[PDB]
Amino acid sequence: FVPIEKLQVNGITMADVKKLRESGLHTAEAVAYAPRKDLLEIKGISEAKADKLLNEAARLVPMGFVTAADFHMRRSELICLTTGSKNLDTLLGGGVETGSITELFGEFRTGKSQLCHTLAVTCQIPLDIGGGEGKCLYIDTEGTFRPVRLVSIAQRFGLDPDDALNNVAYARAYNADHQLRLLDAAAQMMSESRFSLIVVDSVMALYRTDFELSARQMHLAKFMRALQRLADQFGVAVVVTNQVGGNIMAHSSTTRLGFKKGKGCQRLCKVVDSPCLPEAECVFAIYEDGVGDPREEDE
Amino acid sequence: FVPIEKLQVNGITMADVKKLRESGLHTAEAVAYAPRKDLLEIKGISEAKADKLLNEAARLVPMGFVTAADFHMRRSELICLTTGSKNLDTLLGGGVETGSITELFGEFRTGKSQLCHTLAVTCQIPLDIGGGEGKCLYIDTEGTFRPVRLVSIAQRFGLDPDDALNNVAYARAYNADHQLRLLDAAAQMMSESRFSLIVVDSVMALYRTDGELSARQMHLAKFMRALQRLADQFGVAVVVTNQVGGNIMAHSSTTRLGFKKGKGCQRLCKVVDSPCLPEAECVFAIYEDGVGDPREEDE
Amino acid sequence: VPIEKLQVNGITMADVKKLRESGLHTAEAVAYAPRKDLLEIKGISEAKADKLLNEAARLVPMGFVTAADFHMRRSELICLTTGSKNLDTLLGGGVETGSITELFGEFRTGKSQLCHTLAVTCQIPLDIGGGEGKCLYIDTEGTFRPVRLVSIAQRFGLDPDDALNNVAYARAYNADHQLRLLDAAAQMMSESRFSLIVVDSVMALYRTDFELSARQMHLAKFMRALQRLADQFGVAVVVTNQVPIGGNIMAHSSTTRLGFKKGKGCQRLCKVVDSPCLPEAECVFAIYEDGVGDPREEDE
Amino acid sequence: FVPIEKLQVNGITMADVKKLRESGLHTAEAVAYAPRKDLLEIKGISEAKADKLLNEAARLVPMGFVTAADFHMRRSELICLTTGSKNLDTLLGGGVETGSITELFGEFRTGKSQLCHTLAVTCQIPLDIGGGEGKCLYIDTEGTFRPVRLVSIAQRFGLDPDDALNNVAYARAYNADHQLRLLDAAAQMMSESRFSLIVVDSVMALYRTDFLSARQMHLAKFMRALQRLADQFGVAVVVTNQVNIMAHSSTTRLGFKKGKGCQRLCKVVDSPCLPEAECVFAIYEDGVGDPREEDE
Amino acid sequence: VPIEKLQVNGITMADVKKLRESGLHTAEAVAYAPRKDLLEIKGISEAKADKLLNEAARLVPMGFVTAADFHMRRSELICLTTGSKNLDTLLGGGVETGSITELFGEFRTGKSQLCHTLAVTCQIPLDIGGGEGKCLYIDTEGTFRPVRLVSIAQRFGLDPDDALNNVAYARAYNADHQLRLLDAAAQMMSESRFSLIVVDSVMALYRTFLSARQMHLAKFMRALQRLADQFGVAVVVTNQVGGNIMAHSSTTRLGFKKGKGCQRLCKVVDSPCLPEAECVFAIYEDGVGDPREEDE
Amino acid sequence: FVPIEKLQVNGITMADVKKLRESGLHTAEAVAYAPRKDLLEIKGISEAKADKLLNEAARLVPMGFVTAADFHMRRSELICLTTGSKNLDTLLGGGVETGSITELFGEFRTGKSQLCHTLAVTCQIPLDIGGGEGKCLYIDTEGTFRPVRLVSIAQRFGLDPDDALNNVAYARAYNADHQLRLLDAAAQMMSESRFSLIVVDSVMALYRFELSARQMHLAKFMRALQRLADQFGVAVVVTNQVPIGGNIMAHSSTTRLGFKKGKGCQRLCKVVDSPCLPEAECVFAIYEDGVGDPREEDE
Ligand SMILES: Nc1ncnc2c1ncn2[C@@H]1O[C@H](COP(=O)(O)OP(=O)(O)O)[C@@H](O)[C@H]1O
Ligand SMILES: Nc1ncnc2c1ncn2[C@@H]1O[C@H](COP(=O)(O)OP(=O)(O)O)[C@@H](O)[C@H]1O
Ligand SMILES: Nc1ncnc2c1ncn2[C@@H]1O[C@H](COP(=O)(O)OP(=O)(O)O)[C@@H](O)[C@H]1O
Ligand SMILES: Nc1ncnc2c1ncn2[C@@H]1O[C@H](COP(=O)(O)OP(=O)(O)O)[C@@H](O)[C@H]1O
Ligand SMILES: [Mg+2]
Ligand SMILES: [Mg+2]
Ligand SMILES: [Mg+2]
Ligand SMILES: [Mg+2]
């Protein structure tokens, strides 16, 4: 991404920069994608200078037309992260794709939290072996997150236990308003540092008891679009878990994966929906050290 | 169509042509269709020479009266793009007509994006099979375009895997203002070469996520009107996808096709609104290489 | 009455050509026009304008007319046939030749289908309700398809070739072009018999081009021109409207108004919202591939 | 009225009477009310002849003020025209009165055309039931006139349909000049046959498109001509309008408002003697009348 | 922390009393409460409620934190030993305080014995697996036998009078009484330090409820979760062999099987982090402990 | 215990008390332990009336928390019924605890009927020697009622045989509804007179139903038995054949005693379920005078 401090030019005061940052925008992409009406609504900003900064960002941030072959090259360039099972990578065609809010849904005790822990660890590892080189962002709504599993999985991957311990931002929410307030600080801290993943587990746990359906349904809509807005500005893959959101999950999520409890430690994962993948299923396994491919003993 | 650089006659200099270039009228047809008052509102153009260039444009572009024979022959000579499915081809009366807006709508995962991707390759094929011998353009709003689908489909008609990917302009919109802003750039770009298709997917996805209830319709009308002008200016097929506006989208779109999810790869299509087509219904199957007729194995 | 007929006791052809370029192509057009309009035209003197005015007035009756004579004259007016017996009975013969008829309602009500049906029928002989005159179609939304015309002609049995040969189309890209189309079309209404003008739609261009007052008197000018054409040539005029928006400018001009309501599938309800003569009522009609008609019992 | 034939006394030449008829003077009242200056303006009329005719006509009818004791009682026996509804008759205190000017203003679809049709059909019934015992004169300026209507209304009132249609004179104007010109033939018909009601519907419609000071002066000339015709021929005058000179010239003014269904609210606004009150009247296929109990 | 720190920024004592009437005994519940719940309280304005929430957030930590601090916080969490070191090793110190531990299995295996045993351990010092707090035992079948409590206290060396004078028994005859017992007990856990809640059982009353049972059970279970959150107290419940509805909120689940004589087998069936394994313990008159050579 | 008559305060009509008596609630303790619904379907009782009854019961009877010391001292003061044999009383901690569910299951013709008759006789002797000083109600279902044995045990303990016979109300059970009516009448005159022991021999004689419906109705019979025990603190003893019922009856049975037929008239009794008393065994004997300690001649 591009920092917002590289955007001010032609006698635009830093005070305007603070005013924009206090409103939630923290990068050039955020300003460029932001509608001009919202920028005008911010107090203490002239509309003429608002349009000046908007067109300066448009000159800086590229959003013009481009040939499809170039788009193919850029999409091949996109960072992709190994899940931890070669079968999963083959099914995903390389692994989890950033810039896309992937959803993993299914019945509980199928390894969703274990897979999320493995995802955080594989986002801690360097990009050379396919890692993300960035910090995760884990939002828990049930108290299930346990650092011991992270330590074990990191030791499987060989990373420093303390680096993995201190490079994950964990925050447990207690109500829907707490989640929404938490997202703002999440974005603010996202601004300064380099991250590579935002995992939420689970969105509906608090919403199930906080509610009155009409207020609940609209409250997710502004919540989820915040994750979508944050994903494109910073280019971080977004993973959402769920229990068995209706149409909101389907509309918001790009690639969906259903989970099923297989025999023993083996588990089934199915590509229910995808923009460029066929509906195919495969099998992985979960051990005390994380997530891997099923072994001959597991057969 | 009629290139703009051939209407210059009877004492109009290139300065007026450049002024029209900033005015947006990039074709003799465009200036002929534009109302006189808009020409008067253009700074630096006197009303006398405005009416002059208007009458040379009207001489060069026929605004007069045509019989049903002439317009019927022109209808016969209109270019239609093959849908890749004989059932769908017959449902559409032979393809997608020029200078008319098609609105595919329905619930998600019904294959609208697959239909758009399939159409994106039929334009470049030789016209004898039912193409248009041109180069496509893809304006996206949800980030679901995929060159890999074009790679897979180009082999159905034998097209080159890279000549298909270097002859498709691409761009993405992020906010409501950018969606309308892209159209002037599209018109400027398309004035140099024969485009044959435009895609907008989807229309109101940004408008729902953008008191505000009244203000969105007026913005929607301004954007949707611009597409209708674009089709008449250049004679190209524009395809807009919709999710489930109301009257604004119902009135503007020339043709409307509703999609429904069937069993497996089977999907149902119904002509919801057309001026000269019966309200029929057909079935089509999405395969690895695009949209096609259902197979006996899947039936 | 032909314009070339007005040549009496020394009408110079230069004055005739001046009238031609002034837009007046019918004897009624000069008979009804005020003298100030003639004086506003260059090359026209006041005394000669007055004498040509009286020469025009002595042909067409321009005085008191007893109500009985007006009633018998109006009862002889050719009523266009819409093919649907229900709607034809609703309006006492259908659309009348020489008055402004407006159709309005929500979307998906088949007004365009009715316009198409009237366009096809107005070419059939008088016995089957046609006007025996070529049709004119000013379109502002590109909703004309000359493929269905052949099918409708087959339903009405008249030959397809001459039925297609006997229509004129004009696409309208702007309100100024829409107004100029009437001036353009006046001469060919003065060249061969005409019985039907269709405009679709009225409000579409003014909705986008507009500022309220400017739109208001521009629409007033357009409606005045339409009424002038209807009076001069005696040709039926049908216009399409979508929903009212604009207030009363279209309500005062529109002699007849119909409102369309969605029914069940092919069923639609027509209600005479405004009419100086016929009482407010309602009726039902259906649309099929052959055109507008009365719904069948199976469709009920 | 008094025909101009008896005006000639002591060998007054018939040529002068013919010239007066060609000048719009068809009755002795017109000559009496005409000043000397317009008589001088007429070609072939001398000053001596002008003053002689003024003396002959003035000695027949007075012009100045009168004693109110006879004035109010003589105003009672004036011809009244019922509107077919008791609400309006009570509101007007006798209904429409001839020899005056009454305006009906309001929005469209308020029955103004319908009430004008009712007046035009009710002007022939005998005076015992609020009739007029005369023929109407309808001037139309929008094409709204639909004869058929009348037949049904006359059958409601029991008059013969053929007589109802044949005894109503109808004119249509295409321009303001044509509208003004029709008044010459109107005056000629007034001279030829007895009429007792005039309707204009609508007076202002053409002036919207035909035209500003020229428009105002033309309206003033039109209204003064109508007032004059009412003066000589004792014909009630009713005008229609859509929503200062017209109000000033008008004596009685009634505003119309749309009620519920067939019901509409009629209100008296300006009147020399009548108070300010409203009423409700219904309009049906048969015409204008009092609301039925079913609509209540 | 006590809600007494809330008396800042000019908010009156009356609001604190109203909150105490609604069970808002400690500041943790005030902070975790949603807006609507505190809005429902009578005599409370939303304007001051915004502040109330602000200082509630300031007093108790609510923002982001790195996982190192979370791990070191949960590592030093108080754990209550069961007297069976085999269990301790299996549970990594014993039962956690502030979470939900569920027991299921055959009644012949014996779980009420463990419920009795844990009652005294909450008072012994922390260095030997104690809690140093009060215990609140709720029974639904009247199995409370203080003689076993005296025996286990003598095994632990504590005074039986101290054991009987420190724990609080409560019995419920219905689901509503069970629900309101928690509300009543909130005052006692507010006024004094408690370190253990034992429920035996949770499905007994619900057996003698079908759809409304799930909502009632969810409310009761989330109330038990709230009590652990608002005071850091351990919560342990028993369940005879709910289902999935209990399973969602079940942080830890232990299944029991009957072995040879007094020997019993305990399996940690479900746990967020702990592996799936089994162990063996024994039951004697002194309580539940590690198996001895006599049972081997 | 608190009589139901004294419960009605503050406008509670006596007809409501009569309706409660007819329904089955004969004491204020029953209303105190009565739930919301059970009071709701009682005739003549409304929601406000039920709330008033519950409030009055809470005022009269302590409904809240009870400390361990108070519960222990109340249990200590509870009257225990002697068995007439030193060994059984020693194994039972002084005898049978009143107001508790005790099940005696064993082989037929092992003196279970004799033991029940002995307990019925000993529940009327003075408290100084472990008696009850109250009436007795013996419910027999197997036709084992023997007045001769009752007279013999009365002579053994010095009780007057006629005073022993008239102090015991004998009830024979034919059907499940019949025994429910019998226990309803039992509570009916318990509301007006004091008793000391309830004997049911045998429970499973009439149940052996429909297998599932047998459990809930038996549980309701167990539930009804517990209600009266808490209302009056009277010992209840039920005999079981050879245990039938399984989990439900095991949970209902607060204490269980298995019986075996030893040599001669001697019999063996062993505890099965006891939260406090450890499991052990004992031996007793049966003679014409009833059930007592074994003698040296049979030992
Ligand atoms: N320490 C561990 N070592 C190995 N496997 C474990 C461990 N803890 C849990 N599991 C496995 O993980 C599963 C729990 O899945 P989980 O990630 O909790 O799904 P959810 O979060 O949806 O409940 C259990 O079925 C169990 O078999
Ligand atoms: N390579 C493929 N082969 C066959 N079917 C596919 C392939 N890729 C996607 N599909 C199917 O086509 C559908 C595409 O739906 P889509 O056009 O994305 O709907 P929307 O545009 O409304 O989101 C998906 O449901 C998917 O199951
Ligand atoms: N050839 C045909 N056969 C049968 N039905 C048709 C045919 N053409 C159009 N229709 C149906 O009739 C309707 C016509 O409505 P339309 O004329 O578009 O109303 P409007 O012009 O007022 O928008 C359309 O909804 C269409 O589904
Ligand atoms: N044949 C008829 N039967 C019943 N009612 C009619 C008939 N003809 C006209 N009307 C009614 O008369 C009214 C005409 O109003 P109109 O007099 O034109 O008002 P305005 O003169 O103010 O425009 C219409 O509202 C209509 O309902
Ligand atoms: Mg989970
Ligand atoms: Mg799509
Ligand atoms: Mg249409
Ligand atoms: Mg009218």
mmCIF file of N, CA and C and ligand atoms in Angstrom, chain A residues 273-279, chain B residues 107-114 149 201 243 267 286-288, ligand 2:
data_model
loop_
_atom_site.group_PDB
_atom_site.id
_atom_site.type_symbol
_atom_site.label_atom_id
_atom_site.label_comp_id
_atom_site.label_asym_id
_atom_site.label_seq_id
_atom_site.Cartn_x
_atom_site.Cartn_y
_atom_site.Cartn_z
ATOM 1 N N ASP A 273 -18.446 -22.404 -3.002
ATOM 2 C CA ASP A 273 -18.534 -21.314 -3.960
ATOM 3 C C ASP A 273 -17.146 -20.748 -4.214
ATOM 4 N N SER A 274 -16.933 -20.277 -5.440
ATOM 5 C CA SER A 274 -15.660 -19.691 -5.838
ATOM 6 C C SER A 274 -15.817 -18.966 -7.168
ATOM 7 N N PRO A 275 -15.128 -17.840 -7.367
ATOM 8 C CA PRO A 275 -15.235 -17.140 -8.654
ATOM 9 C C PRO A 275 -14.481 -17.820 -9.782
ATOM 10 N N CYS A 276 -13.466 -18.636 -9.481
ATOM 11 C CA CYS A 276 -12.678 -19.257 -10.538
ATOM 12 C C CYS A 276 -12.320 -20.711 -10.240
ATOM 13 N N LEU A 277 -13.028 -21.370 -9.324
ATOM 14 C CA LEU A 277 -12.696 -22.746 -9.002
ATOM 15 C C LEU A 277 -13.924 -23.642 -9.112
ATOM 16 N N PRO A 278 -13.753 -24.889 -9.539
ATOM 17 C CA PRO A 278 -14.879 -25.824 -9.569
ATOM 18 C C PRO A 278 -15.172 -26.391 -8.189
ATOM 19 N N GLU A 279 -16.385 -26.920 -8.047
ATOM 20 C CA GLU A 279 -16.821 -27.491 -6.777
ATOM 21 C C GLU A 279 -16.139 -28.836 -6.562
ATOM 22 N N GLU B 107 -30.568 -14.065 -8.181
ATOM 23 C CA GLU B 107 -29.765 -14.360 -7.009
ATOM 24 C C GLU B 107 -28.344 -14.734 -7.430
ATOM 25 N N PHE B 108 -27.442 -14.748 -6.453
ATOM 26 C CA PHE B 108 -26.034 -14.976 -6.739
ATOM 27 C C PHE B 108 -25.813 -16.416 -7.201
ATOM 28 N N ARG B 109 -24.577 -16.699 -7.609
ATOM 29 C CA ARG B 109 -24.096 -18.012 -8.039
ATOM 30 C C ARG B 109 -24.904 -18.600 -9.194
ATOM 31 N N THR B 110 -25.730 -17.795 -9.858
ATOM 32 C CA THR B 110 -26.558 -18.261 -10.961
ATOM 33 C C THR B 110 -25.846 -18.197 -12.307
ATOM 34 N N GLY B 111 -24.577 -17.803 -12.331
ATOM 35 C CA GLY B 111 -23.802 -17.844 -13.554
ATOM 36 C C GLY B 111 -23.826 -16.595 -14.402
ATOM 37 N N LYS B 112 -24.221 -15.450 -13.843
ATOM 38 C CA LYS B 112 -24.194 -14.210 -14.612
ATOM 39 C C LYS B 112 -22.766 -13.820 -14.977
ATOM 40 N N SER B 113 -21.848 -13.895 -14.010
ATOM 41 C CA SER B 113 -20.451 -13.581 -14.295
ATOM 42 C C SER B 113 -19.861 -14.566 -15.294
ATOM 43 N N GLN B 114 -20.269 -15.834 -15.215
ATOM 44 C CA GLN B 114 -19.829 -16.809 -16.207
ATOM 45 C C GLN B 114 -20.331 -16.438 -17.595
ATOM 46 N N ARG B 149 -10.478 -17.802 -16.882
ATOM 47 C CA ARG B 149 -11.677 -18.253 -17.579
ATOM 48 C C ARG B 149 -11.586 -17.966 -19.072
ATOM 49 N N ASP B 201 -20.519 -4.876 -13.821
ATOM 50 C CA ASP B 201 -20.904 -5.955 -12.917
ATOM 51 C C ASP B 201 -20.331 -5.653 -11.540
ATOM 52 N N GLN B 243 -28.160 -7.608 -8.914
ATOM 53 C CA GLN B 243 -28.372 -8.524 -7.805
ATOM 54 C C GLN B 243 -29.718 -8.249 -7.148
ATOM 55 N N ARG B 267 -28.918 -24.432 -15.075
ATOM 56 C CA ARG B 267 -29.440 -23.161 -14.603
ATOM 57 C C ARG B 267 -30.529 -22.701 -15.558
ATOM 58 N N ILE B 286 -23.113 -24.581 -17.164
ATOM 59 C CA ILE B 286 -21.769 -24.027 -17.099
ATOM 60 C C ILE B 286 -20.780 -25.180 -17.036
ATOM 61 N N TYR B 287 -19.807 -25.179 -17.937
ATOM 62 C CA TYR B 287 -18.790 -26.213 -18.000
ATOM 63 C C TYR B 287 -17.424 -25.575 -17.766
ATOM 64 N N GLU B 288 -16.371 -26.367 -17.966
ATOM 65 C CA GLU B 288 -15.020 -25.849 -17.785
ATOM 66 C C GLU B 288 -14.701 -24.770 -18.815
HETATM 67 N N1 LIG G 2 -14.751 -23.696 -13.943
HETATM 68 C C1 LIG G 2 -16.066 -23.870 -13.669
HETATM 69 N N2 LIG G 2 -16.764 -24.895 -14.206
HETATM 70 C C2 LIG G 2 -18.070 -25.077 -13.942
HETATM 71 N N3 LIG G 2 -18.790 -24.274 -13.138
HETATM 72 C C3 LIG G 2 -18.216 -23.210 -12.532
HETATM 73 C C4 LIG G 2 -16.791 -22.941 -12.772
HETATM 74 N N4 LIG G 2 -16.482 -21.842 -12.063
HETATM 75 C C5 LIG G 2 -17.610 -21.440 -11.426
HETATM 76 N N5 LIG G 2 -18.643 -22.253 -11.710
HETATM 77 C C6 LIG G 2 -20.019 -22.109 -11.185
HETATM 78 O O1 LIG G 2 -20.619 -20.956 -11.773
HETATM 79 C C7 LIG G 2 -21.246 -20.142 -10.782
HETATM 80 C C8 LIG G 2 -20.857 -18.688 -11.012
HETATM 81 O O2 LIG G 2 -21.824 -17.809 -10.446
HETATM 82 P P1 LIG G 2 -21.585 -16.226 -10.572
HETATM 83 O O3 LIG G 2 -21.664 -15.868 -12.034
HETATM 84 O O4 LIG G 2 -20.350 -15.883 -9.775
HETATM 85 O O5 LIG G 2 -22.856 -15.579 -9.834
HETATM 86 P P2 LIG G 2 -22.791 -14.038 -9.382
HETATM 87 O O6 LIG G 2 -22.140 -13.343 -10.552
HETATM 88 O O7 LIG G 2 -24.235 -13.664 -9.161
HETATM 89 O O8 LIG G 2 -21.948 -14.059 -8.129
HETATM 90 C C9 LIG G 2 -20.794 -20.643 -9.421
HETATM 91 O O9 LIG G 2 -21.935 -20.967 -8.622
HETATM 92 C C10 LIG G 2 -19.979 -21.894 -9.683
HETATM 93 O O10 LIG G 2 -20.567 -23.009 -9.010
#
